[PDB]
From a paper:
The developmental regulator monocytic leukaemia zinc finger protein (MOZ) also known as (MYST3/KAT6A) is a MYST (Moz, Ybf, Sas, TIP60) family acetyltransferase that is required for self-renewal and differentiation of haematopoietic stem cells. In addition to the MOZ acetyltransferase domain (referred to as the MYST domain), the N-terminus of MOZ contains two tandem PHD fingers comprising the double PHD finger (DPF) domain. The structure of MOZ DPF shows the typical globular domain of a DPF with PHD1 and PHD2 each harbouring two zinc atoms coordinated by C4-H-C3 motifs in cross-brace topology. The structures combined with biochemical studies reveal how MOZ DPF manipulates the structure of the H3 tail to sample its modification status and promote its acetylation.
To understand the molecular basis of H3 recognition by MOZ and the consequences of H3K9 and H3K14 acetylation, we determined crystal structures spanning MOZ DPF (194–323) alone and in complex with a series of histone H3 peptides (1–21), unmodified or acetylated at H3K9 or H3K14 to 3.0 Å, 1.6 Å, 1.6 Å and 2.5 Å resolutions, respectively. In our structures, residues L194–D199 at the N-terminal boundary of PHD1 form a helix (denoted as α1) that folds back onto the DPF core and interacts with the PHD2 subdomain through salt bridge interactions between E197 and R286, hydrophobic contacts engaging L194 and I309 and interactions between the H196 and R269 side chains. Other interactions between the PHD1 and PHD2 subdomains are observed, including a hydrogen bond between W257 and D285. On H3 binding, subtle conformational changes in the DPF domain occur in regions of direct contact with H3, including a side chain rotation of F280 and changes in a linker region (designated L1), which harbours a helical turn in the H3 complex (A275-N277; labelled as α3a in Figure 2B) but not in the unbound DPF structure. The side chain of H3K4 inserts into a pocket on the surface of MOZ DPF that is partially occluded by residues from the L1 linker in the unbound DPF crystal structure.
Residue numbers in the entry: 193 to 269, 274 to 316
Amino acid sequence: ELPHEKDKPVAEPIPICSFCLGTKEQNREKKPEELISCADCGNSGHPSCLKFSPELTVRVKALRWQCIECKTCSSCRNADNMLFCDSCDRGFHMECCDPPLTRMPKGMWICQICRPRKKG
Ligand SMILES: [Zn+2]
Ligand SMILES: [Zn+2]
Ligand SMILES: [Zn+2]
Ligand SMILES: [Zn+2]
């Protein structure tokens, strides 16, 4: 976790999925599933509705996660030219990546935090 994530207020979570309108007891298949909630605005989603894998779900539950609208660059601190890490869902401007990106990767992308550059 980044320092500026470890100390800040966490908004009250809204106990409904913004996607399916169900509670923790009813996802899209009407089965129970704990919500993930934005620490800034409190908006929630079922991990299944957010299309997160279980591994990502587990990682994000451990972090101060921001929803799509609240998301801020973890480098410079939304537009359409943000990248979201497929490991932690943090946002980074392409020009804020290390090294900087100029085109959308075809496949997966991971940030420096989840996989620091090989300093040999
Ligand atoms: Zn849902
Ligand atoms: Zn939010
Ligand atoms: Zn990451
Ligand atoms: Zn940035």
